Design a protein around this nucleic acid. Structure first.
Lengths: 63, 63
DNA sequence: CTAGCGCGCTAG
DNA sequence: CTAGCGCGCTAG
């Protein structure tokens, strides 16, 4: 419930309790939360993709 | 002669005397040098695209 | 090893 | 307004 998105063709969402590795070519923050059990499961989460629980991560980071 | 690259299907190169606006989604540094006269002319210049005259720009920047 | 999600401004 | 250059790690 911290962020949401869609990969391949399935919607997915996870709270901060499963997010940690998140980089960003130049789209948003390719984050990894899970993939059915807990294998990170990358995904692209844009500040507009999460419920206001992401754009704030860049507010204190790249600001 | 500061950087080089290729857009659409044509090679192009320009010295620092014509480069200034350069951002980067997540590929390198989309820079603008010219387009036949001097209209900026964007282009993607990766640290490996320029003759060692670019990777140094990120050495002091994002390092 | 392989596609995969997107962008970023971009010029006219 | 429109395509355009690429990536980044990404999981197995």
């Amino acid at each position: 419930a911290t962020v949401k998105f869609k990969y391949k063709g399935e919607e997915k969402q996870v709270d901060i309790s499963k997010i940690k590795k998140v980089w960003r070519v130049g789209k948003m923050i390719s984050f990894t939360y899970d993939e059915g059990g807990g294998k990170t499961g990358r995904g692209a989460v844009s500040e507009k993709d999460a419920p206001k629980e992401l754009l704030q991560m860049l507010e204190k980071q790249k600001k």
